């Protein structure tokens, strides 16, 4: 089901510069030893393949321009080799590590979601994001939910899809196992077929993405 959502402390909108151009995405504060880690799509912080983003801003609980917990700047960005070197959609997930803001670590201010890797295929999910393309305008949190199924057409990426109306800008937004934003994150919004596709696909969170998380979370 597609719905409007009140802001969630740990879920945020991303504003970034990549390859010299300005874009938006969505992301999520995830549990990590550094208390500074944000999950998103690889394509939200790296050309895939190519350079990393030159500026990356995370705004937790963004609503209509408001930044109730401030604007957070990335100090480092981590994507798997398969993304950064090959642009492989199978591995379209990455993790940003944020600078402190006013002497505070992100997770201490907004909390964080637990993560899961190497889980079952075909789980049920609720996905969140800040869709920014018609009929949406990027200003507010939205969600989709459903049971994950395989990509019937391009199954070569091991991705999974759920019914969803979220558009460009929702990329990188978290997939939570179950029906709540309080759950474990286990994928991100990655792609759809066309600008207003009725299915959202997210990559399988396996060992490669886990390894990227592990390095980011300590950094």
Neighbours of 159 (CB within 10 A): 21
Final residue before a domain boundary, out of 113, 135, 162: 113
- Domains of the chain: total: 2
86 and 138 both lie in a single domain = no
Read off the tokens for 16: 């970034």
- Partners of 201 in beta bridges: 161, 191
Say how far apart CA 17 and CA 22 lie, in whole Å.
Answer: 5
50 and 108 both lie in a single domain = yes
Query: Do residues 101 and 72 make contact, with C-beta atoms less than 8 angstroms apart?
Result: yes
Sign of CA pseudo-dihedral 198, 135, 64, 20 = positive
104 and 122 both lie in a single domain = no
Say which residues have a Cβ less than 8 Å from residue 3's Cβ, sequence separation at least 6: 142, 143
Final residue before a domain boundary, out of 113, 129, 164: 113
147 and 211 both lie in a single domain = yes
This structure's resolution (Å) is 1.7
72 and 120 both lie in a single domain = no
94 and 167 both lie in a single domain = no
Work out the angle at residue 48's Cα, subtended by the Cα atoms of residues 73 and 169, and round it to the nearest 5 degrees: 55
Read off the tokens for 192: 């759809």
Resolved by: X-ray
120 and 108 both lie in a single domain = no
Instruction: Give the range of the structural domain holding residue 199, as residue numbers without chain letter.
Output: 114-219
Residue whose C-alpha is closest to residue 42's, from 180, 177, 218, 205: 205
Residue whose C-alpha is closest to residue 72's, from 53, 54, 58: 58
> Residue written as tokens 């390859």?
19
What is the 3-state secondary structure of the chain?
CCEECCCCCCEEEEEEEECCEEEEEEEEEECCCCCCEEEECHHHCECCCCCECCEEEEEECCECCECCCCCEEEEEEECCHHHHCCCCHHHCCEEEEECCECCECHHHHHCCECECCCCCCCCEEEEEECCCCCCCCCCCCEEEEEECEECCCCHHHCCEEEECCCCCCCCCCEEEECCCCCCCEEEECCECCCCCCCEEEECCCCHHHHHHHHHHHHC
6 and 97 both lie in a single domain = yes
Q: In what order do the strands lie in the sheet with 3-4?
A: 3-4, 142-147, 124-129, 174-177, 185-188
1 and 109 both lie in a single domain = yes
21 and 106 both lie in a single domain = yes
Say how far apart CA 16 and CA 56 lie, in whole Å.
Answer: 4
Say how far apart CA 82 and CA 99 lie, in whole Å.
Answer: 26
The domain spanning residue 186 has which CATH number?
2.40.10.10
Final residue before a domain boundary, out of 62, 88, 113: 113
154 and 174 both lie in a single domain = yes
Is there a cis peptide before residue 135, judged by omega within 30 degrees of 0? yes
99 and 18 both lie in a single domain = yes
């Amino acid at each position: 089901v597609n719905q409007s959502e009140t802001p969630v402390k740990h879920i945020g909108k991303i504003f970034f510069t990549l390859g010299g151009s300005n874009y938006v995405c969505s992301g999520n504060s995830v549990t990590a030893a550094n208390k500074s880690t944000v999950s998103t799509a690889g394509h939200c912080l790296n050309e895939g393949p190519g350079a990393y983003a030159t500026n990356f801003i995370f705004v937790p609980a963004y609503l209509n321009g408001a930044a109730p917990y401030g604007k957070w700047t990335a100090k480092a960005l981590y994507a798997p080799t398969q993304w950064a070197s090959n642009g492989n959609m199978q591995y379209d997930t990455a993790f940003a590590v944020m600078n402190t803001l006013n002497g505070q670590k992100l997770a201490d201010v907004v909390g964080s979601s637990g993560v899961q890797f190497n889980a079952a295929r075909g789980l049920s999910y609720k996905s969140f994001g800040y869709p920014a393309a018609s009929p949406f305008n990027g200003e507010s949190l939205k969600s989709c939910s459903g049971t994950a199924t395989n990509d019937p057409y391009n199954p070569q990426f091991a991705t999974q899809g759920i019914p969803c109306n979220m558009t460009g800008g929702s990329s990188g937004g978290p997939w939570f196992i179950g029906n709540s934003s309080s759950g474990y994150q286990n994928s991100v919004n990655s792609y759809g077929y066309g600008s207003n596709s009725s299915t959202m696909y997210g990559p399988y969170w396996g060992t490669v993405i886990q390894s990227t998380y592990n390095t980011a979370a300590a950094s």
